[PDB]
Design brief:
GO cellular component, one term (chains A, B, C, D, E): transport vesicle membrane
Strand content of chain A: under 5%
GO molecular function, one term (chains A, B, C, D, E): glycerol transmembrane transporter activity
Family (chains A, B, C, D, E): Belongs to the MIP/aquaporin (TC 1.A.8) family.
Structural class of chain A: mainly alpha
Radius of gyration of chain A: 18 Å
Subcellular location (chains A, B, C, D, E): Apical cell membrane; Basolateral cell membrane; Cell membrane; Cytoplasmic vesicle membrane
Oligomer: part of a larger assembly
Distance between the termini of chain A: 38 Å
Number of helices of chain A: 11
Shape of chain A: globular
Number of strands of chain A: 0
Helix content of chain A: 55-70%
Order of helices and strands of chain A: HHHHHHHHHHH
Membrane topology (chains A, B, C, D, E): Multi-pass membrane protein
């Protein structure tokens, strides 16, 4: 260690700073125009879309820890690169929400777009929810990150973005929809709401741990490899697709 | 029997529990923010795109039986895999909705987003519309599931999702937009309201049997053949392509 | 003449029957949930997206006469194939709106989603509007239909769809937004409103005549060819992209 | 001087007249249906996608000066073409808006969708936000204008459009979402309200000069180089590719 | 790396989740029938014996952070698999505690088999107690697991079943009996009583660490090793290799 491994951290740093900034502001309980639920789901999912395409190369754009842990339970990511990843998503998230809280005037930062049990739903329900909410996403990710599909490359960006939105449009009412704890952590950090918390620890982790396992062992045949998958995804462009077809034709 | 297929069922058992668990919730009459037709349409279409995206190298994601009947009547598929898949989807649906009944508190779990005739239309109007709602879609599907369009490989997941939504945007006032019985089935199972059921059995079957037949025959082949189609769809990827054989003879 | 030339007519017939059906219903002044302008713009643009992808192969999916006339002023289409095209879009449109008027109950078919000068706008303004409204579209089309771009094939479907929506979100208030007279003709046919009509004859025709000329002569260098462009676009798949690269490598 | 370039200016003279003529109209305070933040965001983003789509083989469609300053500072472009393009865009803007003033009747042409600070925020907040609104975008742009990602060629037009919209969904309450002065400029020209102008001069320049510098250097090269980048962008297509040279030596 | 360890870690999450679910369930202050101590005793103890013979071949089924730190200080385990287990134990415990808190209605989830001072004694006396309570088990475990002792193999599980039974038979009256910090964390965790917390972290940590030195150093002769033991545990059925080399050396 190390060389460029670092820059990819900023890409993830920057990406989430933005995503929270964009998202939460787009998600606050603003009195004059109350973000419609879809407006909110869309904001974040798009944030992700921009981030996943812009800093898509560099990262694989997990822009989700559940997704990265998902990537771990299936071995798409290491254990070292993982913790450093987690860190970037976290501090970036709260940085974005921090700039957001200071760029944002006092009157509409009431809730501050908190992830909160709404309308008398128990946490078991919610955890169950967030679980599948992320699960689908981790799967989306997995499906878009699978090396075995490079002729139809797109769209990690949008696909994963809308898988996030997808979850969002649901968890907003159970939970505000985490699927991606940072979305739920940053605002909570800035103003302080811990009611029925763990929900977004296990559901998502499960759903993500699920999604991966489903992907990497259940749905793994000659395909969702382990070493080569990482070699490729981490290898990035100009990737392949290519080397296989060249060396193969030269051969036969 | 069997190989990896199981994993696809699990992929699909997984898939429908989700689309429904997310879905139904997204369309309830929440008094604070009552979902617009469009928001709900978006929920599912997004769902479709993600699930269709998540579990493909394993399952293929028709995420519609009429579409299977379409693909079936279009000879895109055979006779056994159909019945076993239908079962997996149904039980996933009620799995999510029971988990949901358990996930959902007592005071607001009333209608449960049942598919029901809206705005003084007879059953025949509803069935008629669903025909086309699905037809446009099945066509979108068949065209997007088209192997033969690798020059414009895009955009299966979202095309079908947004076709589903397209259908939703009209079909919500005529039918609530089933285009796909399970969505109507799960909640109905849980609560007990059954008038003029068959309406939402017939239309989709017409429109889909149409769309396929229109697509697979009226528009014969369209390059697709019948069985050739099945071969390609079965190889999953990788396997036998036009440009492959091209670059391969050019060098010998 | 002739062989398959015919089937492509149905593809265009079917496509627009649907698009109007979907669109107008999605565009009527329904009292309970008044289609939001965007809902309306989206419905049609999507209709187009489905149609442009589904029957995208077959057609090039003008799903717009202005676009086809555009294709003519630049020679992307013939004069015979043109009139037969116009006919299909027209009778299909009104067929769809006819089924729509009969499938649709009496109370909300008041206006019937008419293209109408709204809020004291003169026709000169409107014609000027619709002009550019379609113009952009014809251009979109032209940009997506250009043979010279086959490595980035997509998305005639969506691109053109949203170029239609794009115009829609505007002309809805000037005009209801034609950009594509059929959208304006069919409902008007079924119920009968001819106030300030010609607007949607010249603006769009101009804007489309413009868009093409801009494309085919202004913006035409070794590229927006005339004969070969047609050979290719009409030639359809498996097109090229290909033959050029093969025969070229075999050569050099 | 000169060759075909003129056609691109005309392509672009054409382009901005449009985006604005459509745009401003889409965002007015129509009393019957008052545009939601989202509807308006959609209007423009769709605009961007279409215009960016329409006139590319000729112009390239930054459809943002900050983006040029980004591409400029990122060495994606030189020093003269900038000034002449800026002029073409500006005059197109006022062309549409004057045609619009002529296109628009007296009773409702009041504010004219002016960019103005909303919800008690200081100029510095506005400028700060626009930074990021644009930054995410410029990054999206640069990543989508990336030659180097041909394994995932998608999705420039819409990515940038929806990034523009993403920016819109937050930026409307902070700034109305300029991300691009002309949108604010045309109407303002027509009506005369000029307080604290400079705000919307500075932010975009920061965020875009950032995004590029972040993209072109902080994230150095990123494969892009400086000049190499310019070469590729200049060849337009067709010209010098990686897989081309591959298949070409393989046969010799 | 890696081979078998993985699932083998996951099993402990699961395992402790069990022992505690049962455990707490058997030790509650149900108003109607307050568990007689032996009921509870045989409950936990037979429970463990079950968990040990059951999950003996994969993990060693410490089912106790104490038992692991013993396995640790005895140089019977590596350092990582431990942190991993224990995390999994704790995390498992509380997973279970959520599931248990969910399984139970509000009226009788009062005490929650909290390890809790019942019937009048100070904490120091209580800890002095938890130490020996866990240690006798640690020793019986060490006593029944000796590779060096084969003439009295049966019945590790049962004698142990009966050992933990025997321990609770005492521990219910005073406390309900942890012997397993995890077992004590979970309830306290969910119910919120971190009263005398360290008591059940230190005692078990402490009591476990003694037995470990006596078996492995003080009472160490030509047998109770470091290495041979670890190798045997690490191997399993098959992949074990010391026993053949021994028989091969012995038959000649």
């Amino acid at each position: 260690r190390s060389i460029a491994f670092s820059r990819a951290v900023f890409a993830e740093f920057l990406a989430t700073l933005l995503f929270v900034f964009f998202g939460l502001g787009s998600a606050l309980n603003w009195p004059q125009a109350l973000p419609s639920v879809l407006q909110i789901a869309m904001a974040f999912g798009l944030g992700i879309g921009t981030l996943v395409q812009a800093l898509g190369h560099i990262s694989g754009a997990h822009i989700n820890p559940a997704v990265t842990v998902a990537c771990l339970v299936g071995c798409h990511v290491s254990v070292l690169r993982a913790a450093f990843y987690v860190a970037a998503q976290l501090l970036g998230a709260v940085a974005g929400a921090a700039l957001l809280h200071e760029i944002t005037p006092a009157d509409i930062r009431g809730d501050l777009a908190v992830n909160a049990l709404s309308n008398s739903t128990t946490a078991g329900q919610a955890v169950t929810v967030e679980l599948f909410l992320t699960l689908q996403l981790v799967l989306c990710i997995f499906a878009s990150t699978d090396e075995r599909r490079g002729e139809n490359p797109g769209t990690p960006a949008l696909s994963i973005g809308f898988s996030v939105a997808l979850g969002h449009l649901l968890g907003i009412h159970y939970t505000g929809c985490s699927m991606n704890p940072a979305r739920s952590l940053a605002p909570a950090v800035v103003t302080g709401k811990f009611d029925d918390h763990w929900v977004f620890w296990i559901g998502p982790l499960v759903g993500a741990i699920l999604g991966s396992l489903l992907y990497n062992y259940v749905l793994f045949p000659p395909a969702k490899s382990l070493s080569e998958r990482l070699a490729v995804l981490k290898g990035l462009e100009p990737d392949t697709d290519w080397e296989e077809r060249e060396v193969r034709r030269r051969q036969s």
